[PDB]
UniProtKB/Swiss-Prot annotation, chain A:
Lineage: Viruses, Riboviria, Orthornavirae, Kitrinoviricota, Alsuviricetes
Organism this protein belongs to: Eastern equine encephalitis virus (EEEV)
Role this protein plays: Class II viral fusion protein. Fusion activity is inactive as long as E1 is bound to E2 in mature virion. After virus attachment to target cell via host VLDLR or LRP8/APOER2 and endocytosis, acidification of the endosome induces dissociation of E1/E2 heterodimer and concomitant trimerization of the E1 subunits. This E1 trimer is fusion active, and promotes release of viral nucleocapsid in cytoplasm after endosome and viral membrane fusion. Efficient fusion requires the presence of cholesterol and sphingolipid in the target membrane.
Posttranslational mods: N-glycosylated.
Subunit: The precursor of protein E3/E2 and E1 form a heterodimer shortly after synthesis. Processing of the precursor of protein E3/E2 into E2 and E3 results in a heterodimer of the spike glycoproteins E2 and E1. Spike at virion surface are constituted of three E2-E1 heterodimers. After target cell attachment and endocytosis, E1 change conformation to form homotrimers. E2-E1 heterodimers interact with host VLDLR or LRP8/APOER2 to mediate viral entry. Interacts with 6K protein.
Protein's UniProt name: Spike glycoprotein E1
UniProtKB/Swiss-Prot annotation, chains B, D:
Posttranslational modification: Phosphorylated on serine and threonine residues.
Residue numbers marked as site, Involved in dimerization of the capsid protein: 76, 109
Function, as annotated: Forms an icosahedral capsid with a T=4 symmetry composed of 240 copies of the capsid protein surrounded by a lipid membrane through which penetrate 80 spikes composed of trimers of E1-E2 heterodimers. The capsid protein binds to the viral RNA genome at a site adjacent to a ribosome binding site for viral genome translation following genome release. Possesses a protease activity that results in its autocatalytic cleavage from the nascent structural protein.
Region (Interaction with spike glycoprotein E2): 44-49, 136-140
Domain notes: The very N-terminus plays a role in the particle assembly process. The N-terminus also contains a nuclear localization signal and a supraphysiological nuclear export signal (supraNES), which is an unusually strong NES that mediates host CRM1 binding in the absence of RanGTP and thus can bind CRM1, not only in the nucleus, but also in the cytoplasm. The C-terminus functions as a protease during translation to cleave itself from the translating structural polyprotein.
Species whose genome carries this gene: Eastern equine encephalitis virus (EEEV)
Assembly information from the UniProt record: Homodimer. Homomultimer. Interacts with host karyopherin KPNA4; this interaction allows the nuclear import of the viral capsid protein. Interacts with spike glycoprotein E2. Interacts with host IRAK1; the interaction leads to inhibition of IRAK1-dependent signaling. Part of a tetrameric complex composed of host CRM1, host importin alpha/beta dimer and the viral capsid; this complex blocks the receptor-mediated transport through the nuclear pore. Interacts with host phosphatase PPP1CA; this interaction dephosphorylates the capsid protein, which increases its ability to bind to the viral genome.
Residues the record lists as Phosphothreonine modifications: 3
Localization annotation: Virion; Host cytoplasm; Host cell membrane; Host nucleus
Name under which the protein is recorded: Capsid protein
Residues of the full protein shown: 109 to 259 of 1239
Domain Peptidase S3: 2-151
Residue numbers annotated as active site: 28 (charge relay system), 50 (charge relay system), 102 (charge relay system)
Length: 49, 151, 52, 151
């Protein structure tokens, strides 16, 4: 071979977009959960106080 | 009053109250309820208010205490005596109540439940009660004076 | 093709217009059954009625 | 009288009734009305409310029970005694009513129908009735406790 591979040379646009949609999906779901937990805490605090 | 002594080893640890078709029981008080028929319903717990819920069996659903969120400051009866609502605080004259008195309803003069108490803290000649109140919008909320301990 | 086009259009049209009639009488039947509810103007316009 | 027993096999299945301009009768009750001047007037059914409605003869017209959607909680009368309106529900003391009681009116103190019963459950020392009410805007709505049965 006249070149060198770099462990990213094969990923390609489709697989990039897929792994992105996956990672972003998991991140978005977890962050949605955490923002939901904060919203419940705040509404309860406003309920009493 | 329709409350029930929860026991374990045959001695009462607290009182369990039915309101609006729902057994209410303070979460912390532990053991067996004194009426078998309640003893079977699976209590569904809620730590945020330290209560364990259960919707009362069909055959008694109309023999359940009422409740209200409408609370003028003033004198409200209670099992062990008269309770004073002042300054958005439940107070009892000193020394009356303690371990076992948790979870007895606090009634108004019209017979309606306005609170169910979970503990108390001494202030001078009175004791402020840690309680479950239905706030001015009716959302259930645990109102507790500072440093109150679980009865 | 034309017989299936006439069939699928007619079937779709009549099922839809029967649903539209069913919802109109399901809107209206409460107000019909309660002789005096002060007539709406978005319900009462949309579905047909002689207003109050 | 101003409400008529519809008949089946001789044995009154359901009292149907004449409210505000329209005879009403529950769909599940199957019977000849026992008043010739109604026993044939075609009925316009509506299953969302479990009822059938029909215009009364132009002579009959001025006998027709009044109604009104404003029903503050309190005591209302009923053939089989008093009904009580609390917590947006009509309740009747236990054991009174059943198969045969369908469709009789519930009247107020000025004598106007506020509700027409379609069913019940006995719940402890009382009975909740599944009924057809005129909601706070005057729209009819079927209010039913859980598990209620066609009387």
């Amino acid at each position: 071979a006249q070149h060198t591979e770099s462990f990213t040379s094969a990923i390609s646009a489709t697989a990039w977009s897929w792994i992105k949609v996956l990672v972003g999906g998991t991140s978005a779901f977890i962050v949605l959960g955490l923002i939901a937990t904060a919203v419940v805490a705040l509404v309860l605090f406003f309920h009493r106080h | 009053d329709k409350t029930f002594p929860i026991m374990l080893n045959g001695q009462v640890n607290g009182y369990a109250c039915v309101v609006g078709g729902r057994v209410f029981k303070p979460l912390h008080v532990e053991g067996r309820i004194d009426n078998e028929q309640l003893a079977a319903i699976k209590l569904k717990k809620a730590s945020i208010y330290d209560l364990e819920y259960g919707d009362v069996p069909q055959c008694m659903k109309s023999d359940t205490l009422q409740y209200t969120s409408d609370k003028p400051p003033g004198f409200y009866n209670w099992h062990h005596g008269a309770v004073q609502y002042e300054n958005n605080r439940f107070t009892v004259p000193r020394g009356v109540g303690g371990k076992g008195d948790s979870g007895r309803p606090i009634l108004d003069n019209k017979g309606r439940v306005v609170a169910i108490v979970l503990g108390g803290v001494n202030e001078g000649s009175r004791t402020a009660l840690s309680v479950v109140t239905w706030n001015q919008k009716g959302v259930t909320v645990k109102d507790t004076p500072e440093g109150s301990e679980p009865w | 093709g034309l017989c299936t086009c006439v069939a699928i259009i007619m079937v779709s049209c009549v099922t839809s217009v029967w649903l539209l009639c069913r919802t109109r009488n399901l809107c209206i039947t409460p107000y019909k059954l309660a002789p005096n509810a002060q007539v709406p103007i978005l319900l009462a316009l949309l579905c047909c009625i002689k207003p109050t």
